[PDB]
Amino acid sequence: ILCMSSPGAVPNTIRLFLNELGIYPSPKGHVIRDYFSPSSEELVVSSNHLLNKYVYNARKSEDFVFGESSAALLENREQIVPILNAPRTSFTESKGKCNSWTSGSQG
């Protein structure tokens, strides 16, 4: 299975399925943002955040482009395989007065 999501697109069935697996995505309103970024227009994630060598190992440094992303919390079990990370400074800020879903590199 491949599966996508975004603060503009959060299917309830997908969210419940992932929660059953152990992954917790963000809700509709919450969106990640990072002030320490080379390009203010959209999210630029550095290739230094790769966390698993077998999926993809960077031969040379590069910059992956993301836009209006939504980080996810992970439980602590042996099947989940983190592949990318969010920059430490970044944080999810929702429109309403809801607590930040994920803060720091935990997302």
């Binding site: 809700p27 919390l73 992970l74 439980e75 607590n99 879903w101 935990q106």
Partner: peptide, 11 residues
């Protein structure tokens, strides 16, 4: 509806 899960930081 929506509840932020409380769990230990991913190791």
């Amino acid at each position: 509806s929506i509840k932020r899960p409380e769990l230990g930081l991913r190791v």
